[PDB]
mmCIF file of C-alpha atoms and ligand atoms in Angstrom:
data_model
loop_
_atom_site.group_PDB
_atom_site.id
_atom_site.type_symbol
_atom_site.label_atom_id
_atom_site.label_comp_id
_atom_site.label_asym_id
_atom_site.label_seq_id
_atom_site.Cartn_x
_atom_site.Cartn_y
_atom_site.Cartn_z
ATOM 1 C CA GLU A 4 -78.167 27.059 43.520
ATOM 2 C CA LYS A 5 -81.360 27.820 45.442
ATOM 3 C CA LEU A 6 -83.874 27.537 42.568
ATOM 4 C CA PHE A 7 -84.378 23.842 43.235
ATOM 5 C CA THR A 8 -85.016 24.129 46.972
ATOM 6 C CA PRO A 9 -88.439 24.141 48.616
ATOM 7 C CA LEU A 10 -90.404 27.225 49.633
ATOM 8 C CA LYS A 11 -93.431 27.580 51.901
ATOM 9 C CA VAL A 12 -96.034 29.659 50.044
ATOM 10 C CA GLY A 13 -98.780 30.284 52.603
ATOM 11 C CA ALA A 14 -100.719 27.036 53.016
ATOM 12 C CA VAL A 15 -98.720 25.047 50.456
ATOM 13 C CA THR A 16 -95.126 24.010 50.046
ATOM 14 C CA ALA A 17 -93.510 24.377 46.635
ATOM 15 C CA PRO A 18 -90.673 21.875 45.991
ATOM 16 C CA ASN A 19 -88.744 24.445 43.910
ATOM 17 C CA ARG A 20 -88.836 28.161 43.160
ATOM 18 C CA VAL A 21 -89.449 27.929 39.393
ATOM 19 C CA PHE A 22 -93.043 29.060 38.968
ATOM 20 C CA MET A 23 -95.275 29.190 35.896
ATOM 21 C CA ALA A 24 -96.493 32.739 35.360
ATOM 22 C CA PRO A 25 -100.155 33.432 34.543
ATOM 23 C CA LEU A 26 -100.588 33.174 30.756
ATOM 24 C CA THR A 27 -103.726 34.073 28.833
ATOM 25 C CA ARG A 28 -104.028 31.572 25.965
ATOM 26 C CA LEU A 29 -107.666 32.203 24.857
ATOM 27 C CA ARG A 30 -108.672 28.580 24.147
ATOM 28 C CA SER A 31 -111.866 28.335 26.240
ATOM 29 C CA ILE A 32 -115.266 27.344 24.872
ATOM 30 C CA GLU A 33 -117.846 29.939 23.890
ATOM 31 C CA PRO A 34 -120.660 30.161 24.727
ATOM 32 C CA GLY A 35 -120.004 29.870 28.452
ATOM 33 C CA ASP A 36 -116.264 30.730 28.741
ATOM 34 C CA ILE A 37 -115.661 27.130 29.731
ATOM 35 C CA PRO A 38 -112.233 25.572 30.389
ATOM 36 C CA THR A 39 -111.472 22.413 28.456
ATOM 37 C CA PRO A 40 -109.717 19.049 28.739
ATOM 38 C CA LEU A 41 -107.084 20.406 26.319
ATOM 39 C CA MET A 42 -106.351 23.139 28.862
ATOM 40 C CA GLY A 43 -106.224 20.421 31.507
ATOM 41 C CA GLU A 44 -103.563 18.562 29.504
ATOM 42 C CA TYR A 45 -101.489 21.749 29.092
ATOM 43 C CA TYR A 46 -101.492 22.386 32.836
ATOM 44 C CA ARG A 47 -100.805 18.714 33.653
ATOM 45 C CA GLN A 48 -97.731 18.784 31.395
ATOM 46 C CA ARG A 49 -96.354 21.654 33.534
ATOM 47 C CA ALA A 50 -97.128 20.116 36.949
ATOM 48 C CA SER A 51 -93.443 19.917 37.948
ATOM 49 C CA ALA A 52 -93.479 23.720 38.381
ATOM 50 C CA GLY A 53 -93.011 24.784 41.980
ATOM 51 C CA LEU A 54 -96.373 26.502 41.506
ATOM 52 C CA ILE A 55 -98.565 26.889 38.428
ATOM 53 C CA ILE A 56 -100.407 30.212 38.290
ATOM 54 C CA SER A 57 -103.307 29.887 35.842
ATOM 55 C CA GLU A 58 -104.301 32.124 32.994
ATOM 56 C CA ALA A 59 -106.374 35.105 34.095
ATOM 57 C CA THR A 60 -109.903 33.917 34.854
ATOM 58 C CA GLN A 61 -113.109 35.970 35.103
ATOM 59 C CA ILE A 62 -114.780 36.524 38.472
ATOM 60 C CA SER A 63 -118.078 37.259 36.673
ATOM 61 C CA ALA A 64 -119.456 37.638 33.150
ATOM 62 C CA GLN A 65 -119.021 41.426 33.456
ATOM 63 C CA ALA A 66 -115.325 40.770 34.169
ATOM 64 C CA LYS A 67 -114.797 39.417 30.634
ATOM 65 C CA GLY A 68 -112.605 41.404 28.272
ATOM 66 C CA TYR A 69 -111.120 38.719 25.988
ATOM 67 C CA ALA A 70 -112.891 36.136 23.847
ATOM 68 C CA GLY A 71 -111.649 32.699 24.878
ATOM 69 C CA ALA A 72 -110.624 33.605 28.439
ATOM 70 C CA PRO A 73 -112.225 31.283 31.015
ATOM 71 C CA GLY A 74 -114.519 32.143 33.900
ATOM 72 C CA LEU A 75 -114.979 30.879 37.438
ATOM 73 C CA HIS A 76 -118.515 32.172 38.067
ATOM 74 C CA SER A 77 -120.834 29.503 36.564
ATOM 75 C CA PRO A 78 -121.604 25.914 37.575
ATOM 76 C CA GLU A 79 -120.247 24.614 34.268
ATOM 77 C CA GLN A 80 -116.968 26.523 34.737
ATOM 78 C CA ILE A 81 -116.615 25.168 38.279
ATOM 79 C CA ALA A 82 -117.180 21.598 37.020
ATOM 80 C CA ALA A 83 -114.615 21.979 34.224
ATOM 81 C CA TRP A 84 -111.965 23.529 36.486
ATOM 82 C CA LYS A 85 -112.464 20.689 39.019
ATOM 83 C CA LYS A 86 -111.297 18.215 36.396
ATOM 84 C CA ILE A 87 -108.286 20.405 35.552
ATOM 85 C CA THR A 88 -107.107 20.834 39.138
ATOM 86 C CA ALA A 89 -107.652 17.095 39.791
ATOM 87 C CA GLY A 90 -105.345 16.339 36.855
ATOM 88 C CA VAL A 91 -102.630 18.665 38.160
ATOM 89 C CA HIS A 92 -102.924 17.127 41.638
ATOM 90 C CA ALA A 93 -102.718 13.599 40.181
ATOM 91 C CA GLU A 94 -99.279 14.674 38.883
ATOM 92 C CA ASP A 95 -98.284 16.061 42.313
ATOM 93 C CA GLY A 96 -98.510 19.699 41.192
ATOM 94 C CA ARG A 97 -99.905 22.834 42.826
ATOM 95 C CA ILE A 98 -102.081 25.353 41.008
ATOM 96 C CA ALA A 99 -103.271 28.878 41.812
ATOM 97 C CA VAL A 100 -106.070 30.551 39.868
ATOM 98 C CA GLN A 101 -105.409 34.122 38.770
ATOM 99 C CA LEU A 102 -108.695 36.017 39.162
ATOM 100 C CA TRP A 103 -109.399 39.221 37.217
ATOM 101 C CA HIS A 104 -111.898 41.784 36.225
ATOM 102 C CA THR A 105 -110.681 43.364 32.980
ATOM 103 C CA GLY A 106 -112.524 46.647 33.502
ATOM 104 C CA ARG A 107 -111.925 48.982 30.562
ATOM 105 C CA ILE A 108 -109.637 46.543 28.681
ATOM 106 C CA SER A 109 -112.708 45.013 27.108
ATOM 107 C CA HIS A 110 -115.277 45.487 24.330
ATOM 108 C CA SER A 111 -119.035 46.011 24.489
ATOM 109 C CA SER A 112 -119.679 43.085 22.111
ATOM 110 C CA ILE A 113 -118.633 40.598 24.796
ATOM 111 C CA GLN A 114 -120.232 42.328 27.791
ATOM 112 C CA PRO A 115 -123.607 41.345 29.270
ATOM 113 C CA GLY A 116 -126.336 43.021 27.208
ATOM 114 C CA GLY A 117 -123.730 44.386 24.770
ATOM 115 C CA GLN A 118 -123.094 47.323 27.102
ATOM 116 C CA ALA A 119 -119.960 49.390 27.701
ATOM 117 C CA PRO A 120 -117.462 47.787 30.103
ATOM 118 C CA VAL A 121 -116.926 49.367 33.535
ATOM 119 C CA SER A 122 -113.968 51.145 35.131
ATOM 120 C CA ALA A 123 -112.984 53.677 37.776
ATOM 121 C CA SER A 124 -113.597 56.494 35.280
ATOM 122 C CA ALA A 125 -115.048 56.940 31.780
ATOM 123 C CA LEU A 126 -111.681 56.973 29.993
ATOM 124 C CA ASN A 127 -110.826 54.738 27.041
ATOM 125 C CA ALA A 128 -107.864 52.391 27.609
ATOM 126 C CA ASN A 129 -106.575 53.368 24.136
ATOM 127 C CA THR A 130 -105.332 49.841 23.527
ATOM 128 C CA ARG A 131 -106.648 46.603 22.052
ATOM 129 C CA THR A 132 -108.156 43.432 23.401
ATOM 130 C CA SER A 133 -108.586 40.025 21.739
ATOM 131 C CA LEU A 134 -111.975 39.054 20.345
ATOM 132 C CA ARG A 135 -112.861 36.143 18.046
ATOM 133 C CA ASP A 136 -113.891 36.465 14.421
ATOM 134 C CA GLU A 137 -116.735 34.510 12.746
ATOM 135 C CA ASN A 138 -114.401 31.500 12.350
ATOM 136 C CA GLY A 139 -113.394 31.512 16.037
ATOM 137 C CA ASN A 140 -109.890 32.933 15.494
ATOM 138 C CA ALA A 141 -108.287 35.549 17.766
ATOM 139 C CA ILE A 142 -108.378 39.130 16.440
ATOM 140 C CA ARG A 143 -107.101 42.338 18.048
ATOM 141 C CA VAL A 144 -109.797 45.027 18.428
ATOM 142 C CA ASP A 145 -109.745 48.533 19.901
ATOM 143 C CA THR A 146 -111.178 48.802 23.423
ATOM 144 C CA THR A 147 -114.611 50.321 24.128
ATOM 145 C CA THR A 148 -114.899 53.501 26.204
ATOM 146 C CA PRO A 149 -115.991 52.428 29.681
ATOM 147 C CA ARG A 150 -118.722 53.546 32.049
ATOM 148 C CA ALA A 151 -117.529 54.785 35.456
ATOM 149 C CA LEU A 152 -118.793 52.534 38.252
ATOM 150 C CA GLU A 153 -121.332 54.158 40.566
ATOM 151 C CA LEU A 154 -120.344 54.268 44.231
ATOM 152 C CA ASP A 155 -123.175 51.843 45.038
ATOM 153 C CA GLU A 156 -121.805 49.298 42.514
ATOM 154 C CA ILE A 157 -118.500 48.904 44.412
ATOM 155 C CA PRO A 158 -119.751 46.409 47.016
ATOM 156 C CA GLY A 159 -120.963 44.163 44.187
ATOM 157 C CA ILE A 160 -117.468 44.095 42.672
ATOM 158 C CA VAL A 161 -115.997 43.120 46.051
ATOM 159 C CA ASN A 162 -118.628 40.398 46.370
ATOM 160 C CA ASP A 163 -117.814 39.096 42.873
ATOM 161 C CA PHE A 164 -114.174 38.580 43.897
ATOM 162 C CA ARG A 165 -115.338 36.923 47.163
ATOM 163 C CA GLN A 166 -117.747 34.626 45.317
ATOM 164 C CA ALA A 167 -115.109 33.691 42.738
ATOM 165 C CA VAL A 168 -112.770 32.730 45.607
ATOM 166 C CA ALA A 169 -115.482 30.509 47.144
ATOM 167 C CA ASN A 170 -115.838 28.935 43.706
ATOM 168 C CA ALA A 171 -112.037 28.574 43.325
ATOM 169 C CA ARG A 172 -111.679 26.796 46.657
ATOM 170 C CA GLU A 173 -114.486 24.424 45.623
ATOM 171 C CA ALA A 174 -112.847 23.940 42.193
ATOM 172 C CA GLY A 175 -109.701 22.578 43.863
ATOM 173 C CA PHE A 176 -107.230 25.419 43.422
ATOM 174 C CA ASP A 177 -104.483 25.532 46.039
ATOM 175 C CA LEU A 178 -104.219 29.349 46.092
ATOM 176 C CA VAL A 179 -105.761 32.374 44.417
ATOM 177 C CA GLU A 180 -103.847 35.232 42.811
ATOM 178 C CA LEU A 181 -105.676 38.551 42.628
ATOM 179 C CA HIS A 182 -104.921 40.310 39.340
ATOM 180 C CA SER A 183 -104.011 43.812 40.514
ATOM 181 C CA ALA A 184 -101.616 44.471 37.613
ATOM 182 C CA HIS A 185 -101.340 45.302 33.916
ATOM 183 C CA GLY A 186 -104.045 47.932 33.679
ATOM 184 C CA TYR A 187 -107.008 45.659 34.554
ATOM 185 C CA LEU A 188 -109.779 46.764 36.939
ATOM 186 C CA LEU A 189 -107.932 46.771 40.255
ATOM 187 C CA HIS A 190 -104.967 48.601 38.647
ATOM 188 C CA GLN A 191 -107.385 51.036 36.946
ATOM 189 C CA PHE A 192 -108.394 52.143 40.453
ATOM 190 C CA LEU A 193 -104.800 52.179 41.772
ATOM 191 C CA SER A 194 -103.405 54.408 39.013
ATOM 192 C CA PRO A 195 -104.077 58.185 38.916
ATOM 193 C CA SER A 196 -103.801 57.955 35.093
ATOM 194 C CA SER A 197 -106.974 55.850 34.873
ATOM 195 C CA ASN A 198 -108.718 56.996 38.069
ATOM 196 C CA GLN A 199 -110.112 60.535 38.074
ATOM 197 C CA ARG A 200 -112.778 59.805 40.694
ATOM 198 C CA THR A 201 -113.477 62.387 43.370
ATOM 199 C CA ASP A 202 -115.215 60.026 45.839
ATOM 200 C CA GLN A 203 -113.645 57.661 48.456
ATOM 201 C CA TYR A 204 -112.272 55.450 45.647
ATOM 202 C CA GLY A 205 -110.129 58.129 43.956
ATOM 203 C CA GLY A 206 -107.733 60.968 44.735
ATOM 204 C CA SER A 207 -105.377 60.032 47.556
ATOM 205 C CA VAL A 208 -103.376 56.800 47.405
ATOM 206 C CA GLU A 209 -105.448 55.558 50.363
ATOM 207 C CA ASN A 210 -108.582 56.051 48.256
ATOM 208 C CA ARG A 211 -107.027 54.593 45.096
ATOM 209 C CA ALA A 212 -105.949 51.428 46.974
ATOM 210 C CA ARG A 213 -109.278 51.198 48.810
ATOM 211 C CA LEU A 214 -110.927 48.790 46.355
ATOM 212 C CA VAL A 215 -108.004 46.362 46.148
ATOM 213 C CA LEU A 216 -107.675 46.274 49.949
ATOM 214 C CA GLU A 217 -111.445 45.674 50.355
ATOM 215 C CA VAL A 218 -111.060 42.794 47.903
ATOM 216 C CA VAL A 219 -108.059 41.389 49.790
ATOM 217 C CA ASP A 220 -109.968 41.571 53.088
ATOM 218 C CA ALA A 221 -113.082 39.951 51.585
ATOM 219 C CA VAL A 222 -111.151 37.025 50.069
ATOM 220 C CA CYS A 223 -109.056 36.445 53.211
ATOM 221 C CA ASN A 224 -112.319 36.243 55.164
ATOM 222 C CA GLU A 225 -113.887 33.884 52.617
ATOM 223 C CA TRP A 226 -110.955 31.462 52.704
ATOM 224 C CA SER A 227 -107.739 32.210 54.639
ATOM 225 C CA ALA A 228 -104.960 34.822 54.231
ATOM 226 C CA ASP A 229 -102.457 32.000 53.642
ATOM 227 C CA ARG A 230 -104.391 31.081 50.471
ATOM 228 C CA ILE A 231 -104.225 34.557 48.890
ATOM 229 C CA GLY A 232 -101.585 36.046 46.596
ATOM 230 C CA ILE A 233 -101.650 39.257 44.614
ATOM 231 C CA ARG A 234 -99.974 40.343 41.388
ATOM 232 C CA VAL A 235 -98.983 43.989 41.025
ATOM 233 C CA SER A 236 -97.106 45.936 38.364
ATOM 234 C CA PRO A 237 -96.604 49.117 40.386
ATOM 235 C CA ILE A 238 -93.488 50.585 38.718
ATOM 236 C CA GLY A 239 -93.560 51.722 35.095
ATOM 237 C CA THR A 240 -96.199 51.581 32.375
ATOM 238 C CA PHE A 241 -98.302 48.556 31.340
ATOM 239 C CA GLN A 242 -100.924 48.700 28.558
ATOM 240 C CA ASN A 243 -101.005 52.536 28.794
ATOM 241 C CA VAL A 244 -101.559 52.519 32.560
ATOM 242 C CA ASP A 245 -98.662 54.208 34.308
ATOM 243 C CA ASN A 246 -98.415 54.318 38.089
ATOM 244 C CA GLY A 247 -98.692 58.070 38.543
ATOM 245 C CA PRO A 248 -96.180 60.677 39.717
ATOM 246 C CA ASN A 249 -95.307 59.050 43.068
ATOM 247 C CA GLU A 250 -95.116 55.428 41.996
ATOM 248 C CA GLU A 251 -92.530 54.182 44.518
ATOM 249 C CA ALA A 252 -94.117 55.774 47.597
ATOM 250 C CA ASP A 253 -97.573 54.652 46.479
ATOM 251 C CA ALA A 254 -96.277 51.100 45.910
ATOM 252 C CA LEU A 255 -94.723 50.945 49.381
ATOM 253 C CA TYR A 256 -97.983 52.173 50.944
ATOM 254 C CA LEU A 257 -99.905 49.371 49.225
ATOM 255 C CA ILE A 258 -97.287 46.779 50.164
ATOM 256 C CA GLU A 259 -97.267 47.810 53.849
ATOM 257 C CA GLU A 260 -101.066 47.517 53.846
ATOM 258 C CA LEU A 261 -100.933 44.062 52.213
ATOM 259 C CA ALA A 262 -98.384 42.929 54.827
ATOM 260 C CA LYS A 263 -100.887 43.682 57.608
ATOM 261 C CA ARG A 264 -103.185 40.990 56.182
ATOM 262 C CA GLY A 265 -100.528 38.258 56.321
ATOM 263 C CA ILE A 266 -101.226 37.093 52.767
ATOM 264 C CA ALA A 267 -99.320 34.246 51.141
ATOM 265 C CA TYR A 268 -97.403 36.169 48.484
ATOM 266 C CA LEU A 269 -96.653 39.342 46.559
ATOM 267 C CA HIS A 270 -95.989 38.750 42.838
ATOM 268 C CA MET A 271 -94.267 41.675 41.133
ATOM 269 C CA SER A 272 -94.513 41.950 37.361
ATOM 270 C CA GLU A 273 -91.509 44.138 36.707
ATOM 271 C CA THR A 274 -91.842 44.953 33.002
ATOM 272 C CA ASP A 275 -93.880 44.239 29.882
ATOM 273 C CA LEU A 276 -92.427 42.488 26.818
ATOM 274 C CA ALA A 277 -90.912 45.706 25.426
ATOM 275 C CA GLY A 278 -88.819 46.095 28.583
ATOM 276 C CA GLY A 279 -87.732 49.129 30.538
ATOM 277 C CA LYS A 280 -85.739 50.384 33.507
ATOM 278 C CA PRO A 281 -84.915 47.660 36.028
ATOM 279 C CA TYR A 282 -86.072 47.805 39.651
ATOM 280 C CA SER A 283 -83.386 49.467 41.795
ATOM 281 C CA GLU A 284 -81.876 47.333 44.533
ATOM 282 C CA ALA A 285 -82.901 50.119 46.987
ATOM 283 C CA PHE A 286 -86.538 49.701 45.958
ATOM 284 C CA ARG A 287 -86.296 45.913 46.274
ATOM 285 C CA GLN A 288 -84.854 46.376 49.796
ATOM 286 C CA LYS A 289 -87.695 48.727 50.765
ATOM 287 C CA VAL A 290 -90.241 46.148 49.562
ATOM 288 C CA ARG A 291 -88.487 43.297 51.363
ATOM 289 C CA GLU A 292 -88.364 45.019 54.758
ATOM 290 C CA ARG A 293 -92.110 45.796 54.529
ATOM 291 C CA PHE A 294 -93.517 42.445 53.374
ATOM 292 C CA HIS A 295 -93.161 39.179 55.306
ATOM 293 C CA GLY A 296 -94.645 36.696 52.854
ATOM 294 C CA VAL A 297 -93.167 35.235 49.694
ATOM 295 C CA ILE A 298 -92.008 37.619 46.982
ATOM 296 C CA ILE A 299 -92.170 36.371 43.376
ATOM 297 C CA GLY A 300 -90.295 38.308 40.677
ATOM 298 C CA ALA A 301 -91.258 38.212 37.006
ATOM 299 C CA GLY A 302 -90.465 39.829 33.658
ATOM 300 C CA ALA A 303 -87.768 38.597 31.272
ATOM 301 C CA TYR A 304 -85.947 36.778 34.056
ATOM 302 C CA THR A 305 -83.153 34.327 33.546
ATOM 303 C CA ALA A 306 -82.349 31.535 35.989
ATOM 304 C CA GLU A 307 -79.096 33.380 36.768
ATOM 305 C CA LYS A 308 -80.937 36.616 37.655
ATOM 306 C CA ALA A 309 -83.364 34.662 39.848
ATOM 307 C CA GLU A 310 -80.466 32.968 41.668
ATOM 308 C CA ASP A 311 -78.749 36.326 42.141
ATOM 309 C CA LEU A 312 -81.793 37.992 43.700
ATOM 310 C CA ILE A 313 -82.746 34.935 45.782
ATOM 311 C CA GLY A 314 -79.124 34.832 47.029
ATOM 312 C CA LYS A 315 -79.311 38.530 47.925
ATOM 313 C CA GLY A 316 -82.401 37.795 50.047
ATOM 314 C CA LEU A 317 -84.589 40.111 47.969
ATOM 315 C CA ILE A 318 -87.036 37.663 46.331
ATOM 316 C CA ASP A 319 -88.029 34.061 47.048
ATOM 317 C CA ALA A 320 -89.157 32.721 43.667
ATOM 318 C CA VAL A 321 -89.338 33.564 39.979
ATOM 319 C CA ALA A 322 -92.264 33.224 37.583
ATOM 320 C CA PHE A 323 -91.399 32.444 33.954
ATOM 321 C CA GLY A 324 -93.980 33.148 31.253
ATOM 322 C CA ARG A 325 -92.806 32.500 27.701
ATOM 323 C CA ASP A 326 -90.230 29.899 28.703
ATOM 324 C CA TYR A 327 -93.140 27.976 30.356
ATOM 325 C CA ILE A 328 -95.266 28.227 27.209
ATOM 326 C CA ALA A 329 -92.505 26.412 25.327
ATOM 327 C CA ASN A 330 -91.003 24.108 27.980
ATOM 328 C CA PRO A 331 -93.373 21.912 29.984
ATOM 329 C CA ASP A 332 -90.367 20.543 31.900
ATOM 330 C CA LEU A 333 -88.718 23.932 32.412
ATOM 331 C CA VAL A 334 -87.679 22.875 35.931
ATOM 332 C CA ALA A 335 -85.656 19.891 34.640
ATOM 333 C CA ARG A 336 -84.192 21.949 31.792
ATOM 334 C CA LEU A 337 -82.979 24.696 34.131
ATOM 335 C CA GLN A 338 -81.662 22.123 36.610
ATOM 336 C CA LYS A 339 -79.718 20.284 33.874
ATOM 337 C CA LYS A 340 -78.683 23.449 31.959
ATOM 338 C CA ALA A 341 -80.402 22.060 28.861
ATOM 339 C CA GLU A 342 -81.452 24.154 25.879
ATOM 340 C CA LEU A 343 -84.965 25.573 25.794
ATOM 341 C CA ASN A 344 -87.456 24.720 23.064
ATOM 342 C CA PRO A 345 -87.949 27.334 20.331
ATOM 343 C CA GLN A 346 -90.981 29.516 21.037
ATOM 344 C CA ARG A 347 -93.756 29.884 18.430
ATOM 345 C CA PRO A 348 -95.444 33.232 19.206
ATOM 346 C CA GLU A 349 -98.040 32.905 16.444
ATOM 347 C CA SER A 350 -99.847 30.288 18.577
ATOM 348 C CA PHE A 351 -99.676 32.068 21.929
ATOM 349 C CA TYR A 352 -103.306 33.323 21.580
ATOM 350 C CA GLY A 353 -106.261 31.233 20.417
ATOM 351 C CA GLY A 354 -106.354 28.111 18.316
ATOM 352 C CA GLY A 355 -105.965 24.563 19.550
ATOM 353 C CA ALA A 356 -103.372 21.971 20.491
ATOM 354 C CA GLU A 357 -100.737 23.265 18.074
ATOM 355 C CA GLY A 358 -98.392 25.618 19.944
ATOM 356 C CA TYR A 359 -100.105 24.647 23.209
ATOM 357 C CA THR A 360 -99.686 20.959 24.160
ATOM 358 C CA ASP A 361 -97.134 19.976 21.462
ATOM 359 C CA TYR A 362 -93.945 21.412 22.966
ATOM 360 C CA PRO A 363 -91.861 18.384 23.997
ATOM 361 C CA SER A 364 -90.133 17.499 27.218
ATOM 362 C CA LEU A 365 -86.488 16.470 27.239
HETATM 363 C C1 FMN B 1 -99.139 35.041 25.890
HETATM 364 C C2 FMN B 1 -99.037 35.789 27.201
HETATM 365 C C3 FMN B 1 -100.129 35.858 28.053
HETATM 366 C C4 FMN B 1 -100.067 36.518 29.279
HETATM 367 N N1 FMN B 1 -101.161 36.487 30.106
HETATM 368 C C5 FMN B 1 -101.051 37.014 31.349
HETATM 369 C C6 FMN B 1 -102.091 36.832 32.285
HETATM 370 O O1 FMN B 1 -103.122 36.134 32.034
HETATM 371 N N2 FMN B 1 -101.924 37.386 33.514
HETATM 372 C C7 FMN B 1 -100.815 38.109 33.840
HETATM 373 O O2 FMN B 1 -100.764 38.600 34.990
HETATM 374 N N3 FMN B 1 -99.793 38.257 32.973
HETATM 375 C C8 FMN B 1 -99.892 37.711 31.740
HETATM 376 N N4 FMN B 1 -98.833 37.775 30.897
HETATM 377 C C9 FMN B 1 -97.522 38.202 31.443
HETATM 378 C C10 FMN B 1 -96.696 37.020 31.922
HETATM 379 O O3 FMN B 1 -97.242 36.480 33.129
HETATM 380 C C11 FMN B 1 -95.248 37.449 32.194
HETATM 381 O O4 FMN B 1 -95.250 38.401 33.289
HETATM 382 C C12 FMN B 1 -94.528 38.047 30.949
HETATM 383 O O5 FMN B 1 -94.654 37.114 29.863
HETATM 384 C C13 FMN B 1 -93.060 38.421 31.156
HETATM 385 O O6 FMN B 1 -92.321 37.285 31.602
HETATM 386 P P1 FMN B 1 -91.426 36.312 30.619
HETATM 387 O O7 FMN B 1 -90.301 37.167 30.062
HETATM 388 O O8 FMN B 1 -90.972 35.228 31.571
HETATM 389 O O9 FMN B 1 -92.367 35.804 29.537
HETATM 390 C C14 FMN B 1 -98.883 37.135 29.680
HETATM 391 C C15 FMN B 1 -97.783 37.076 28.797
HETATM 392 C C16 FMN B 1 -97.854 36.417 27.574
HETATM 393 C C17 FMN B 1 -96.639 36.366 26.684
HETATM 394 O O1 P81 B 2 -102.777 39.567 24.386
HETATM 395 N N1 P81 B 2 -103.781 39.012 25.146
HETATM 396 O O2 P81 B 2 -104.719 38.530 24.553
HETATM 397 C C1 P81 B 2 -103.748 39.013 26.431
HETATM 398 C C2 P81 B 2 -102.705 39.520 27.102
HETATM 399 C C3 P81 B 2 -102.591 39.625 28.579
HETATM 400 C C4 P81 B 2 -103.557 39.183 29.488
HETATM 401 C C5 P81 B 2 -103.363 39.400 30.854
HETATM 402 C C6 P81 B 2 -102.241 40.082 31.294
HETATM 403 O O3 P81 B 2 -102.063 40.326 32.588
HETATM 404 C C7 P81 B 2 -101.280 40.521 30.390
HETATM 405 C C8 P81 B 2 -101.469 40.308 29.034
#
């Protein structure tokens, strides 16, 4: 078994390769999109993870697409996250913040000024996001048609990611994970399906990857390359965003570019909850020979699959999502071959302590 051996992940050393995937739980305070002590307790309970990757967190107010998702742009958010990371560190854990802009997976009612959300192009996501009703409960609502960003708005987006990374470093996070997956803003630019621009940010794969690479360069300069990870979902379809007609070649282009920056890790989200075709071993080999940081695999993994791929030299770590919702001590359970707590999906999104901090350890 290799799952319980250490791994250098850029600037930090994980004691095991069982990571907690980023999980939106929609329990932040509104107004202000403020993280809470309850959230702090949830993360503290999971501090034995080799690395905790936080729920997706807004880089700016404009970034918001879900009611109850936290930000990392305001003083009050910074102050609240400081307490949370301190708690994780007091339990000898490590925590990365996943930073997003939701782009078109959003709703005008939660945007600044009540305006349409922004994207690469003015194309509706044709999916739903999660808002809150008058009683504060999560509700699924159709996404608002976005406004295409003007060319002169692009530098501001890059700066928002940079600023959020400055704030993250101050807030005590050990690493940052850029959310370049799942049909959110960075992926909206990457994918031909959502990007019909005819300027330097659309068309060719070079142009489609331009924004994400500008963001990577800006955040490496703000902090250090060994503090930066990125999550991609570059094969298949996620929330109606496919990866275009040349998905493998386009993915390898992006990955070779990322490798040049010497970033800490590449986190590949391989499938959504409905599943689909597995990654080919040939594709995994092509990724591995191009990227010289840590590779994290995710998407309906088992410990046995993680061991197999780690043993084959193709990935370095695995991120578990739903098993981490339900098992604060997932590391110990996998080490001991113990049963896993029964998941309660009705309390994944919104609410309070129930279905959040009440799953027991062994
Ligand atoms: C409730 C829930 C929230 C999620 N939130 C995020 C998120 O904030 N960021 C992200 O990149 N993926 C998110 N995902 C995807 C998970 O990180 C993970 O990739 C997915 O659950 C598949 O892995 P699993 O089979 O181990 O759960 C979420 C998944 C679930 C079930
Ligand atoms: O259902 N939700 O409210 C959120 C889901 C979600 C958020 C981020 C992500 O990368 C995937 C799913």
